[PDB]
Amino acid sequence: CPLMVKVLDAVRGSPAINVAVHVFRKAADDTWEPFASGKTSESGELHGLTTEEQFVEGIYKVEIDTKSYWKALGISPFHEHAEVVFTANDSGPRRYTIAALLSPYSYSTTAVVTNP
Amino acid sequence: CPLMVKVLDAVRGSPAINVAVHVFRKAADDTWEPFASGKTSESGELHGLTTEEQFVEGIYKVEIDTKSYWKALGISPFHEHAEVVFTANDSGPRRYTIAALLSPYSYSTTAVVTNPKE
Amino acid sequence: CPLMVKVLDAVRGSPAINVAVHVFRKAADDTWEPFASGKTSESGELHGLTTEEQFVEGIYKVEIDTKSYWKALGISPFHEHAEVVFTANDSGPRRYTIAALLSPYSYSTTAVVTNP
Amino acid sequence: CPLMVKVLDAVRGSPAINVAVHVFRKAADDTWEPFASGKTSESGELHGLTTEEQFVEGIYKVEIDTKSYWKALGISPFHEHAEVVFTANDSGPRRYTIAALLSPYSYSTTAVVTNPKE
Numbered sequence A, C: 001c002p003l004m005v006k007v008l009d010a011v012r013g014s015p016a017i018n019v020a021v022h023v024f025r026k027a028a029d030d031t032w033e034p035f036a037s038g039k040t041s042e043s044g045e046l047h048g049l050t051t052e053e054q055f056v057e058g059i060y061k062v063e064i065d066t067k068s069y070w071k072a073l074g075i076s077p078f079h080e081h082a083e084v085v086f087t088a089n090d091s092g093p094r095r096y097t098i099a100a101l102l103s104p105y106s107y108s109t110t111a112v113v114t115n116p
Numbered sequence B, D: 001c002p003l004m005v006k007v008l009d010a011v012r013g014s015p016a017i018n019v020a021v022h023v024f025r026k027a028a029d030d031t032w033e034p035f036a037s038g039k040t041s042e043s044g045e046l047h048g049l050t051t052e053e054q055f056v057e058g059i060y061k062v063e064i065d066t067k068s069y070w071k072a073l074g075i076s077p078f079h080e081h082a083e084v085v086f087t088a089n090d091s092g093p094r095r096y097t098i099a100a101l102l103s104p105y106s107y108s109t110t111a112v113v114t115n116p117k118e
Ligand SMILES: N[C@@H](Cc1ccc(Oc2ccc(O)c(I)c2)c(I)c1)C(=O)O
Pocket: A006, A008, A097, A099, A100, A101, A108, A109, A110, A112, C006, C007, C008, C015, C099, C100, C101, C108, C109, C110
C-alpha cells in the first residue's frame, strides 16, 4: 500500500470520517489527471488507493474536501479544500502517509516517508 | 491592506525571508488568472498585493513557493508548494491575513479575518 | 490500552524514535507523582503505559523529552521539553491518543478521544 | 520588548482575546517563582511583561490559560493549559515572541528569536 491518508478533527479530538479525497497525477500537458479516489473510514483512514506498479515517480496532488466536512457539522469554514502537492521520487517510489489535522480556520499537514 | 501574508520558519525560529508568493482569482471560464505577486520581507511579511476596489468577491488561490526556500537552505523538502484556496468578500468586504509556519515535511496555515473600520 | 503516545519528526518526515516520555498524576498535595514511563519505538509509538484499573479520573501530565532528541541530531532546539496536561474524565475513563509533531522551534499536539 | 506573546483562535479565525498568561523563572532552590502576568489584548497580543534588565539568563515557563478561554465560549476543551518551557538569554540577550494557535483538542506553538539592535 504505497499511499495512505489519515485525517483528524481538532475541534472534537476524533478522526475525520467520510471525508472525500481525490488524487491527481501531473500530465504531459501539465494538466491534472484523476488517479485515485475515496472516503475516509471510521478511523479517518484511506488506503489501497494504488499499487506499487501503478504508483510511479511523478507529481501528485491530494485534494481533501474539508469544506463539505464542516458544513455537515453546521460550521462555516474558511477553506474551499486542503491540497497537498509533492514529487513521489525520494529514492525510487516508497511508503507515503499524508496526514492532515483540521480546524474551521486552519489546517496542518505532514508526510511520513518510511520504507519497511 | 485587504490581503496580507506572514510566513515563519520552524527549523530556525525566524521569519521566512524572500519567499515568493503568487495570487490567482478563479475566472469566469473557470480558469485561474494571475492577480498579484510578491516576496516576503525581512519580517516574513507581504503587503500591498491589492486594493479594496480591486479585491472583489471571488475564489482566490495563494500559492507559496516553499520548495525554492528549502532548496536555498540546502534542504530537499517534501512539498512542491503550499496553496491556500478560499472564497473572499462574499458577505461584504473583509481583511484577510494568511499565515504559514513551515517545516521541511510539514506546514501549518491559518487565517485571521477582520471586519473593516467604517 | 487506555493511553498511547505517538511522536513524529517534521524535519525528516519520519517517526521520532527513542524519545523519552514520563507520565505524572496530580497528587493530594498538588505535586506531581511519577506514574508511567517509556521510550518511543521504531514507529514513534508508546503503549501499555497503564491499565484500565490503574487509569482513574484525575489530572495527568505527559512530558516529552524533545531537547534530547534534537541534540542527538546535532540540532540546537528551543524547548526544554513538550508538556501535555489534561483531565482524564470525559464520560468516565476512555481511549486517549496523545500525538506530537516536532520541529526545532515548534511543536503541535492533538488528542484523539475514541471509545471502541 | 524582550518577551511578547501572540495567541490566535483556529475555530473562529481571529485573535484570542483576554486570554490569561503567567510567566515563571526556575529558582535557585529549583522552584518555579512568579515572574510576570497579563492578558491578551484585542489583537491577541501581550506586551510589557518585563525589561531587558529584569530578563536575565534562566529557565522560563509561559503558561497560557487555554481552559478558561474555551469554557467562556461554551466549549469543554481537552487541555488544562498550554505551557512553553525554554532557556533564555544564555548566549547573550535576545528578543522572544512565543505564538500559539488554539483549537479545543489541539494547539500549536512556535518561537521567533531575534538579536537586538545595537
Ligand atoms: N500516525 C500516522 C500519521 C499521523 C497523522 C496525524 C498525526 O497527528 C498530528 C498532531 C498534530 C498535527 O499538527 C498534525 I498535521 C498531526 C500524527 I503525530 C501522525 C503514521 O505515522 O503512519
